[PDB]
Design a protein around this ligand. Structure first.
Ligand SMILES: CCCCCCCCOCCOCCOCCOCCO
Ligand SMILES: CCCCCCCCOCCOCCOCCOCCO
Ligand SMILES: CCCCCCCCOCCOCCOCCOCCO
Ligand SMILES: CCCCCCCCOCCOCCOCCOCCO
Ligand SMILES: CCCCCCCCOCCOCCOCCOCCO
Ligand SMILES: CCCCCCCCCCCC[N+](C)(C)[O-]
Length: 183
């Protein structure tokens, strides 16, 4: 597999970790991954996706603002078994980068006096465990479980300027996908 380059396309579901309430909704997007096989086990993977849309809310108010973000992640991977194996599970470690954007309070949020919402970027440790089933020499199916440190702060104006709340997304990411190989 050394020298190989493959791409996976599939769904990438993001399940944040418990951010009244103040909770963040789950969300699935088109997840694409680009991996380069350093040497039959070591590979470099890049995770990309369509922009994620999340909702924020108190069980008292219901949704009150919606958020968007790109969580690109770079990872060093270890593929168990040899090139010849057709069932190659793997573990990976790397760094994450999330960029929030196009964030805003609902009408109801506004009603409650919320305004001007924005979130600062994030960087963090990231790890994964997943398996690639190599059907043909050109195709594979795949599952993957990621975990990323995605801590960030929200700045808004509740009536005046109570704009400082930390948000700990620390999401678990699941990805079911198929992939094509370019030797
Ligand atoms: C880098 C950001 C990605 C957004 C750009 C769109 C990229 C273009 O299309 C790539 C083709 O991917 C689409 C295929 O459908 C997904 C695969 O089927 C899933 C298997 O369960
Ligand atoms: C072989 C083609 C199947 C295409 C794969 C795309 C996956 C299907 O849609 C999932 C819809 O997103 C919302 C579901 O909740 C997240 C849980 O993961 C579900 C899929 O196994
Ligand atoms: C070659 C074997 C593949 C297995 C990877 C294990 C390699 C060891 O861990 C690397 C960890 O890299 C991530 C560091 O944490 C993120 C740093 O903070 C980012 C900047 O603010
Ligand atoms: C809450 C915990 C959820 C527990 C999930 C257990 C999931 C464990 O791994 C399942 C891996 O899938 C196995 C593959 O299918 C068997 C052989 O491959 C088939 C190709 O013809
Ligand atoms: C020659 C074709 C071989 C193709 C192999 C098909 C293997 C497909 O996957 C079997 C395992 O899928 C079952 C598990 O349920 C889906 C995951 O759990 C969802 C939420 O965490
Ligand atoms: C991804 C996290 C986005 C955070 C959105 C910020 C929500 C702040 C919550 C305002 C609480 C409103 N209040 C007073 C009516 O309860």
């Amino acid at each position: 597999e050394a020298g190989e380059f493959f791409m996976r396309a599939g769904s990438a579901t993001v399940r944040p970790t418990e951010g009244g309430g103040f909770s963040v909704t789950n969300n699935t997007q088109l997840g694409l991954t680009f991996t380069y096989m350093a040497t039959d086990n070591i590979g470099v993977e890049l995770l990309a996706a369509t922009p994620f849309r999340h909702k924020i809310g108190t069980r008292a108010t219901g949704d009150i603002a919606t958020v968007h973000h790109l969580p690109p992640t770079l990872m060093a991977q270890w593929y168990f078994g040899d090139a010849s194996s057709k069932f190659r599970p793997y573990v990976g470690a790397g760094i994450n980068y999330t960029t929030f954007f196009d964030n805003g309070f609902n009408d109801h949020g506004k009603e409650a006096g919320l305004s001007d919402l924005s979130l600062k970027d994030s960087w963090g440790a990231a790890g994964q465990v997943g398996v690639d089933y190599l059907i043909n020499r050109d195709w594979l199916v795949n599952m993957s479980v990621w975990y990323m440190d995605i801590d960030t702060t929200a700045n808004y104006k509740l009536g005046g300027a109570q704009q400082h709340d930390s948000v700990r997304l620390d999401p678990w990411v699941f990805m079911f996908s198929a992939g094509y190989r370019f030797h």
